[PDB]
Write a protein that binds this ligand. Structure first.
Ligand SMILES: [Mg+2]
Ligand SMILES: [Mg+2]
Ligand SMILES: [Mg+2]
Ligand SMILES: [Mg+2]
Ligand SMILES: [Mg+2]
Ligand SMILES: [Mg+2]
Ligand SMILES: [Mg+2]
Ligand SMILES: [Mg+2]
Ligand SMILES: [Mg+2]
Ligand SMILES: [Mg+2]
Lengths: 243, 215, 45, 79, 117, 95, 87
RNA sequence: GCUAAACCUAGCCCCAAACCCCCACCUUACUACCACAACUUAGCCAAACCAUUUACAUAAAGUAUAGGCGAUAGAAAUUGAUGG
RNA sequence: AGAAAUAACUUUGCAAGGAGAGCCAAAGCUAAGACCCCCGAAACCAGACGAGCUACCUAAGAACAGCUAAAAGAGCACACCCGUCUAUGUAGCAAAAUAGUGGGAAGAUUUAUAGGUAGAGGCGACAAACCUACCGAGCCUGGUGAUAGCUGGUUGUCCAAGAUAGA
RNA sequence: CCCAAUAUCUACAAUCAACCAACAAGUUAUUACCCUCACUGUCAACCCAACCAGGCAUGCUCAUAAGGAAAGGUUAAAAAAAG
C-alpha cells in the first residue's frame, strides 16, 4: 500500500501530535527554520550568473556547500564553523591517477576566554578561524551573542548564548555585586540582544532537552477529587441558598 | 576480553602473591609475544628496589640485617629478606650475602669516598672510582631499574661536578646524578650462565613453549 | 570420527546465545529485532 | 616504584557536562525521568544517608572515631 | 538444543537448579555459611474472622429480586459519605470530614499500596 | 582553514530543490590552506601604557599572537571597534 | 478505587511510567518497590530505557507489517460483503 | 476391481481513500527485595581486460554541459499541475 | 522459457498543414497494428553469527594398578591416550568403525569445568594444518534475477522462398 | 542458593613428612546484629551421534551379591569371511 504522508513529513507531523505539540511557538519556529551555514571551506561564487569561456553564453551558477563532519569532541568547544573534510583526491592532481582517500582536519588549540556577561574565564578548544571571528566581532561575548545557531555549530556555544541572554534578560544582580555602575555598563553595552525571558530559556536547547523541560514544567501531582467534589458541592449549595 | 591484569595490589607486604600467567595474550586477547605459556605455577614476592627507604617518621642512614637468601622464580638473582627497625623487605642480594649479615643503607655523601662493604647501598658519588655496583637508578629517588640480573657487575667509571659516569654490563656508559643510590658488589647467583637445562621439558617448566610462525 | 560436535552445556548455551548477550551489543539488539519482525517465538536461546 | 597498575583503579570520572559552568543556567538532567539517557546531562545527586541503618549493610565509622581510641600505639601479641 | 519449552528450575546444572525459584515469595535472607534467617514479619499472617452465627451462605436463593448494575463511582461514594455532613454544617479546613491530605502517617497507604489483599 | 573545490561540476538544482550529489562529487582539490597565508596584523587601541609599543589613547597595529596573549587579556588594550573610538576621544579632550 | 480517587486522585494503585524499551517499543513500566535510590542500583542502571538510532528503521517495518495486516482484513471484509449481496 | 480421479471456498494480489495502534520480564530475559554508555555506501556490474569513469507530472531535452571527449552521465532558466 | 525503441510497411482521420499547448512540416502529420527468452558458475564487496568440534592460551580441579628401579621427559605393563601393519566393512554398526597386531603410559602426559583469541582475521612443535562433518581461505543475510563470447533448454496446424567468396 | 564494615596481618612447600637429597619454588582486634529452616534438584530403560559394534569426567565392586542372551525354523551346495 501507500502511506498518507511521505517519509520526510513524519518528523514535522510528530512535532504537532504529542508533548512536542505543547512547546511554545517560537521554539518550534526556531527549530523548523533552516539556514545555510556561512561558507567556510569553499569559495562562494560571487553572483547569480556568469559567462563561461568554453562557449561564451550566460549560464546560471549556484554554490553547492561542501559536506563537513563535526566529531563529538567539538561539541565541547568553539571550533567556529570549521570541521573535518572527508573525501577523495586524485593522486597527482591529474584525473588519470588513482582516486585516494583523504581527510583534512583543522588545527586545534586550547585557550582561555573571558566572558563579561558571565564574568568567567572558560578554557575552550578553538581554531584560528574562531579567534579571527572573535576579533572581527570585538570580543567573545559579541561573537557568541550575534552569531546564529547555524554558524556556531557547537552545543557549548549555544549554551553560552543561553546563559548570556538569560543574564541580560533578567538583569539579575549576580554579575558584579558591590558595583551596580559596572553592572549597568555591561548590561547596556549589549542592550541590543535583549529578548524576553520566555524566549531566553529555550535558546539552544536540543529537541530532547526541550521535551524534558516541558514535561518537568507540566508534570504535577493529580488533584484529589475530594477537593474538586467539595468545591462543586459548595457551588451548588450557594446557588440553592441565593435562590 | 574481560582481562583485569593481576598486578592490582596497592599495599606492600612480604607475603607472596598469586601470579596469573599471560601466555603472550595482551588485554585484547591476541598473541602479542610468541613463545610464552604454561609452565610451573608461580607466586610473586614484591621485591622493593628503592633500597634507601626510611621507615615511617624516621630518617638518616639505617642498618638492616638479613634473615634468609632464597631462590626466587621470577628473578634470575636470589632475593633476601632484610629486617630493619620494624619492617621486613625483599631486596635483591649480591653474591656473598649469608644469613645473619648486616648491611648499611645511607644517602650521606661524605667528605671523600667511604670504603663500602660489598652489600651496602650508597649514593654514586660516595663511592670511589673503579668499584662494582648493582641496582643503579637512572635518576634519584626513583628505584633500581638498571643492573639487576644474575651475576652482572657494573663498574663505576668517573665523577664530575654533580654527575657520575657508570659503565653498564652491555659495555657502554651513562651519566647519572651523583645522589643516585646504588649497591656495591655483584648481583647474586653467579655462574648462572652454566645451566645446561638438558631437555625440552625444563624449558616447558620455566614457561617457554616452541612456537612456529611469528609473522 | 565426526558428528558429535555438540557437547551440550546449559551454561555455555545461555552465555553465548542468551538474551543478555544479545542485548549487550548493538548487533545483538539488531538480531533480536529481526527475529521480532519475522514473527519468531524463540527470540533468544 | 608505586604499587598498583593504573588499569585496575576505580576510574577517572567522565568529563563533566559544560552546562554546569554557565553561572545562570540550571541544566536539563535526566533526574526527572528516573533512568539514564545518553543525550542529557548526568545529574549530581545528594550523598544518600539511610535514616535507619540495617545490620546486614552496616558500615563502621573509621578507626579514628571509635570510643576506645588511644593516640599512643599499643603493641599487642595475639595468637 | 531445546528453545521452545519454558525454562524452569528443573533445567540447568546444580547452580542454576538452585538459584532459579518457582514463583514462591521469600521470607528471609541468607546469612554467612548458607544459613537462612527467617523474619516473622515477611510471612503473611492470615486474618480469618469468626464465622459463628453468620447468616450468609455460599449461594443465594432463586427467590431474590433483580436490580441494575450501578458500579460505585467516586461521586456516588462522596454523595453519601461526606456530603450530608457538609450540608448539615453548611448552615453555619477539610480534614474534619474524613479528608486525608497526606499518606505517610497511616498504616494502610492508598497510593502507593503498602498493604495486601 | 582548508579551502577545497570540486573536480566535477555539480549539476544545478533549481530554486526550491536541493542538489543531489553522486560518488564523483566528493573528489576534491586543495584550493589553499589559510594558515600558510602570509601573516596578518590586527588593529586595536590602548587603555593603559607599555613603553615597548606606545602609550594610552592611540591606534596600534600589532601582531595577532602578541595582541591576543598579552595586550588583550590583561586590560592593556581593547578592540579598535566603532564604539570605543568615540569613547577615547574624550580621554584626550579632557587633557 | 473510589477511596483512592477521593483521597489522592490517582488512577492506578501501583505507580508506573511510560518508557521506551531498548527495542523502541513504547511500554508501560510498573515500578518495583526497592529500598535504595535509583542511581545507586547497579542492576537497574544496566537496563536501557531508551532507544538508539539503529531501531528506527525496524520501528518502521513493524509499523508497515501491521498496516498490511489491517488492509487485508479490511479489503477481505468488503469482498465478503459483495458476495453476500450477490446471492 | 483396487489405487485413484473430480470439486469450491478458506484466503490472498493491485489500487483508492484515510496518517496507524492482575504478576513477571536487560542477572542465566519472562527472576518481589542494596553503593561504563550514542552522534562519506565498498563492490558485483559496462567499457566486450582494467587502472579515471559506470544510472538509484507533462515540456523545455536527452538540449546546454561532463567524459580513458570511449562506455556512458546530464541540468536549469521558463511551463503547468471505493474498485478489478 | 520472446518483455521494448529507432526507422520502415499496412490501414484509418486531416491535409500545406497535422496534433486536446511543448513537436514535426519542401506531402506531411496524428492514431493504431507488427518486432528483441529460461536455467547454471567458481567469484567480489558489505554487515551480522560462530572457538560446546578442532589449534593455542588462561583460572581453578582430577587421573595415572602391579613389577623392576629410587628424584629419571627411566624399563616391562593395566586404567587412559594415540592409531604402526594386516583383514573385515565400503549406503557399512560408523558420512572413518570392528578384530587382531602395535607406540606412549610420573610426563613436552591425559583429562572434566568456565573464559579468551573471529575470517586476509585467529591459531599453528609449517602439513596450506585447523577454526561445528565439504578451508590455497568459515558460515549466514544483503548488493543479487552478480556476470558468463561457455553448457543445456525454448511449447499449436499447414504452405512457400531458402547454404560455405572475403576483411 | 551465601557472607556487615574498617585496619591488621599473611617469609619457610607438597610428597605416610621424620631422616638424607633437591627444583620446576608450591585470617585475626574494634564497630553492628540477640533474628531461625524458607526456596529450589530428587522420576526412567536417559545424554552427543538423523535411528547406531561409535563418544562420554569422577567414586566404588576386579570378576562380580550387579547386569545380560552370541542361534526366527530348517539343510549343511558353490564363491566369500573368521578360526
Ligand atoms: Mg524546473
Ligand atoms: Mg568489465
Ligand atoms: Mg574450548
Ligand atoms: Mg545468466
Ligand atoms: Mg570466444
Ligand atoms: Mg521449397
Ligand atoms: Mg535418585
Ligand atoms: Mg544376575
Ligand atoms: Mg539372538
Ligand atoms: Mg537364520
Amino acid at each position: 500500500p501507500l502511506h498518507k504522508y511521505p517519509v520526510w513529513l513524519w518528523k514535522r507531523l510528530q512535532l504537532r501530535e504529542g508533548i512536542c505539540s505543547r512547546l511554545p511557538g517560537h521554539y518550534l519556529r526556531s527549530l523548523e527554520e533552516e539556514r545555510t551555514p556561512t561558507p567556510v571551506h569553499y569559495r562562494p561564487h560571487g553572483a547569480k550568473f556568469k559567462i563561461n569561456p568554453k562557449n561564451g553564453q550566460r549560464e546560471r551558477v549556484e554554490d553547492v556547500p561542501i559536506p563537513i563532519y563535526f566529531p563529538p569532541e567539538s561539541q565541547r568547544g568553539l571550533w567556529g564553523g570549521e570541521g573535518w573534510i572527508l573525501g577523495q583526491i586524485y593522486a597527482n592532481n591529474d584525473k588519470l591517477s588513482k582516486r585516494l582517500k583523504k581527510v583534512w582536519k583543522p588545527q586545534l588549540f586550547e585557550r582561555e576566554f573571558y566572558s563579561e556577561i558571565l564574568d568567567k574565564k572558560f578554557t575552550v578548544t578553538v581554531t584560528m578561524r574562531t579567534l579571527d571571528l572573535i576579533d572581527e566581532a570585538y570580543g567573545l561575548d559579541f561573537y557568541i551573542l550575534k552569531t546564529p545557531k547555524e554558524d556556531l555549530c557547537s552545543k557549548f556555544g549555544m549554551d553560552l548564548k543561553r546563559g548570556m541572554l538569560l543574564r541580560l534578560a533578567r538583569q539579575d544582580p549576580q554579575l558584579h555585586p558591590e558595583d551596580p555602575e559596572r553592572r549597568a555598563a555591561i548590561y547596556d553595552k549589549y542592550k541590543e540582544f535583549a529578548i524576553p525571558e520566555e524566549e531566553a530559556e529555550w535558546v539552544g536547547l536540543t529537541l530532547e532537552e526541550a521535551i524534558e523541560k516541558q514535561r518537568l514544567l507540566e508534570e504535577k501531582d493529580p488533584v484529589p477529587l475530594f477537593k474538586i467534589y467539595v468545591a462543586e458541592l459548595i457551588q451548588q449549595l450557594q446557588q440553592q441558598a441565593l435562590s | 576480553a574481560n582481562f583485569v591484569s593481576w598486578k592490582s595490589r596497592t599495599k606492600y607486604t612480604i607475603t607472596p602473591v598469586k601470579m596469573r600467567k599471560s601466555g603472550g595474550r595482551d588485554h585484547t586477547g591476541r598473541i602479542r609475544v610468541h613463545g610464552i605459556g604454561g609452565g610451573h605455577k608461580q607466586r610473586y614476592r614484591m621485591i622493593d628496589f628503592l633500597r634507601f627507604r626510611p621507615e615511617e617518621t624516621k630518617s638518616g642512614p639505617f642498618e638492616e640485617k638479613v634473615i634468609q637468601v632464597r631462590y626466587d622464580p621470577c628473578r634470575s638473582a636470589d632475593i633476601a629478606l632484610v629486617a630493619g627497625g620494624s619492617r621486613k623487605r625483599w631486596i635483591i642480594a649480591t653474591e656473598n650475602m649469608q644469613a645473619g649479615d648486616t648491611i648499611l643503607n645511607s644517602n650521606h655523601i661524605g667528605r671523600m669516598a667511604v670504603a663500602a662493604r660489598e652489600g651496602d647501598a650508597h649514593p654514586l658519588g660516595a663511592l670511589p672510582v673503579g668499584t662494582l655496583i648493582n641496582n643503579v637508578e637512572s635518576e634519584p629517588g626513583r628505584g633500581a631499574q638498571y643492573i639487576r640480573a644474575a651475576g652482572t657487575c657494573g663498574v663505576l667509571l668517573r665523577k664530575v661536578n654533580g654527575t657520575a659516569i657508570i659503565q653498564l654490563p652491555s659495555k657502554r656508559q651513562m651519566q647519572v646524578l651523583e645522589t643516585c643510590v646504588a649497591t656495591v658488589g655483584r648481583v647474586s647467583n653467579v655462574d648462572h650462565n652454566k645451566r645446561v637445562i638438558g631437555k625440552a621439558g625444563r624449558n616447558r617448566w620455566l614457561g617457554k613453549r616452541p612456537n612456529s610462525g611469528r609473522w | 570420527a565426526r558428528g558429535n560436535e555438540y557437547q551440550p552445556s546449559n551454561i555455555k548455551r545461555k552465555n553465548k546465545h542468551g538474551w543478555v548477550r544479545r542485548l549487550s551489543t548493538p548487533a545483538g539488539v539488531q538480531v533480536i529485532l529481526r527475529r521480532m519482525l519475522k514473527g519468531r517465538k524463540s527470540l533468544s536461546h | 616504584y608505586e604499587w598498583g597498575v593504573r588499569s585496575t583503579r576505580k576510574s577517572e570520572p567522565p568529563p563533566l557536562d559544560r552546562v554546569y559552568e554557565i553561572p545562570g543556567l540550571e541544566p536539563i538532567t535526566f533526574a526527572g525521568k528516573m533512568h539514564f539517557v545518553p543525550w542529557l546531562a548526568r545529574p549530581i545527586f545528594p550523598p544518600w544517608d539511610r535514616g535507619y541503618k540495617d545490620p546486614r549493610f552496616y558500615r563502621s565509622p573509621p578507626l579514628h572515631e571509635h570510643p576506645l581510641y588511644k593516640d599512643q600505639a599499643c603493641y599487642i601479641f595475639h595468637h | 538444543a531445546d528453545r521452545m519449552s519454558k525454562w524452569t528450575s528443573k533445567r540447568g546444572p546444580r547452580s542454576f537448579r538452585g538459584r532459579k525459584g518457582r514463583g514462591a515469595k521469600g521470607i528471609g535472607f541468607l546469612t554467612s555459611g548458607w544459613r537462612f534467617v527467617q523474619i516473622k514479619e515477611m510471612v503473611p499472617e492470615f486474618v480469618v474472622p469468626d464465622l459463628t452465627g453468620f447468616k450468609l451462605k455460599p449461594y443465594v436463593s432463586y427467590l431474590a429480586p433483580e436490580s441494575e448494575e450501578t458500579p460505585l463511582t467516586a461521586a456516588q461514594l462522596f454523595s453519601e459519605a461526606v456530603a450530608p455532613a457538609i450540608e448539615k454544617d453548611f448552615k453555619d479546613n477539610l480534614e474534619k470530614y474524613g479528608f486525608e491530605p497526606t499518606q505517610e502517617g497511616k498504616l494502610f497507604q492508598l497510593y502507593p499500596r503498602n498493604f495486601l489483599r | 582553514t582548508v579551502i577545497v573545490e570540486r573536480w566535477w561540476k555539480v549539476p544545478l538544482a533549481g530554486e526550491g530543490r536541493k542538489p543531489r550529489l553522486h560518488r564523483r562529487h566528493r573528489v576534491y582539490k586543495l584550493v589553499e590552506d589559510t594558515k600558510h597565508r602570509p601573516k596578518e596584523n590586527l588593529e586595536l587601541i590602548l587603555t593603559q601604557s607599555v613603553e615597548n609599543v606606545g602609550v594610552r589613547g592611540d591606534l596600534v597595529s600589532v601582531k595577532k599572537s602578541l595582541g591576543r596573549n598579552r595586550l588583550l587579556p590583561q586590560g592593556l588594550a581593547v578592540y579598535a571597534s566603532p564604539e570605543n573610538k568615540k569613547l577615547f576621544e574624550e580621554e584626550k579632550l579632557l587633557r | 478505587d473510589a477511596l483512592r480517587l477521593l483521597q489522592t486522585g490517582q488512577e492506578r494503585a501501583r505507580p508506573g511510567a511510560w518508557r521506551r524499551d531498548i527495542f523502541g517499543r513504547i511500554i508501560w513500566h510498573k515500578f518495583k518497590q526497592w529500598v535504595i535510590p535509583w542511581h545507586l542500583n547497579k542492576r537497574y542502571n544496566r537496563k536501557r530505557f531508551f532507544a538508539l538510532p539503529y531501531v528506527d528503521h525496524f520501528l518502521r517495518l513493524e509499523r508497515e507489517k501491521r498496516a498490511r495486516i489491517k488492509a487485508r482484513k479490511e479489503n477481505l471484509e468488503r469482498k465478503k460483503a459483495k458476495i453476500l449481496l450477490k446471492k
